[PDB]
Design a protein around this ligand. Structure first.
Ligand code: HEM
Length: 385
């Protein structure tokens, strides 16, 4: 027997290494039911690659529970929380502002920022890679995309961190989050009244239906999006490579391999460990007949280590075929900043490899956040030289 599954209330040691946990449940059964009341609604956890793909592509499974606070206003038009209707119009909106075209031209600036961060990082005995590089890099890149002042990166990040307090994937948390939400709102509303902001504002100045609240809420999502994902990718990437010195060393000596490495590092330990859905109709999955209204949880980290799809899943193999891992999702809700995130991943990782020769040497001090959805270290100390 195994205890009832749930992503909340995980032992700190399992948070550090969840994969063996996924494996035992996955070997037991592809889908696991974790009952409610009665009063319900019941939840179903999907551990298999194929079933996760089924979950993510089924139109009958939507994002919000559809019955069988400057924070509330900031979070209310975040694209990651909208279903197809509201969702379709908004996604189409900012989609091409994150095109390979814009990202490609942004890469040189991303590298410049990564380099600058390292320069400072190099000036301390035992640096924190999270607070000193992984966390500030996404903030700084998106800030340059929004035309925000570079020097605000530290303040903005502090608030992004505060905002996380109220996350449903975590545990007076709302106080800090509301404080932050109000701080962001006041901040961005002042910005609207004077470059992605320009375009979003300009859209309203020339007839495009956009509320100042919508532009503001949008800015807060984009500003905090990479901080809760890319940051975690980079920090865990350092942990993975230190644990796999053969790959770390090959990467140092084969720069052109960075892209494939990032794809495999993403498969191996993805930043977002799960995405939730709600059944709008009865569904069958695994051996389960899932009633309309049940909550369905797609375990991306579990899917990415599914031996049925990835042979020897625990081996870090940069030679696997690309475009299979589901770390950026799959379907209509496929990560919007996937292109931008991938560029920050490759550029930031290369910066670290070329910037910290002893990255793979010595011991490290790591502490993970009590979060099994946005998964990663809250701090990663490194013994340098
Ligand atoms: C490497 C880091 C990242 C990972 C692993 C990641 C992963 C994901 C996943 C799995 C989803 C699917 C959610 C669902 O099924 O409902 C998603 C959605 C989304 N992501 Fe990311 N993401 C990353 C970075 C970013 C960044 C940097 C931005 C901002 C520019 C961003 C913006 C979004 C948006 C707007 C959605 C919702 C899109 C929709 O519903 O159509 N992501 N992401």
């Amino acid at each position: 027997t195994l205890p009832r599954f749930d992503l909340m209330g995980w032992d700190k040691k399992d948070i550090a290494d969840p994969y063996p946990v996924y494996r035992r449940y996955r070997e037991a059964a592809p889908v696991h039911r974790t009952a409610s009341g009665p009063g319900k609604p019941d939840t179903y956890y999907v551990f298999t690659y194929d079933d996760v793909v089924r979950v993510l592509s089924n139109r009958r499974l939507g994002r919000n529970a559809r019955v069988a606070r400057a924070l509330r206003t900031v979070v209310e038009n975040w694209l990651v929380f909208l279903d197809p209707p509201h969702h379709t119009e908004l996604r189409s909106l900012l989609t091409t502002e994150f095109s390979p075209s814009i990202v490609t031209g942004l890469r040189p600036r991303i590298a410049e920022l990564a380099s600058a961060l390292l320069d400072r990082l190099r000036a301390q005995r035992r640096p924190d890679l999270v607070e000193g590089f992984a966390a500030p890099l996404p903030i700084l890149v998106i800030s340059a995309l929004l035309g925000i002042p570079e020097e605000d990166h530290t303040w903005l990040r502090a608030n992004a961190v505060a905002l996380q307090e109220a996350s449903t994937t975590r545990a007076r948390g709302y106080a800090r989050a509301e404080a932050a939400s109000q701080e962001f709102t006041r901040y961005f509303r002042r910005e609207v009244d004077r470059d992605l902001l320009t375009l979003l504002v300009r859209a309203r100045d020339t007839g495009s239906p956009l509320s100042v609240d919508g532009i503001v809420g949008t800015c807060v999502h984009l500003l905090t999006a990479g901080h809760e994902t890319t940051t975690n990718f980079l920090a865990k990437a350092v942990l993975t490579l230190r644990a796999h010195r053969d790959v770390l060393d090959e990467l140092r000596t084969t720069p052109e391999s960075t892209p494939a490495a990032v794809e495999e590092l993403m498969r191996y330990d993805p930043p977002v460990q799960a995405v939730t859905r709600w059944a709008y109709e009865d569904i069958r999955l695994g051996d389960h007949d899932i009633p309309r209204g049940s909550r369905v949880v797609a375990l991306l980290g579990s899917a990415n280590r599914d031996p049925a799809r990835f042979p020897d899943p625990d081996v870090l193999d940069v030679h696997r075929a690309a475009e299979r891992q589901v770390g950026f999702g799959l379907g209509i809700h496929y990560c919007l900043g996937a292109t931008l995130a991938r560029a920050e991943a490759e550029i930031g990782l290369r910066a670290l490899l070329d910037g910290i020769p002893a990255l793979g040497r010595g011991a490290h001090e790591v502490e993970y956040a009590d979060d099994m959805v946005f998964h990663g270290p809250t701090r990663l100390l490194l013994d340098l030289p």
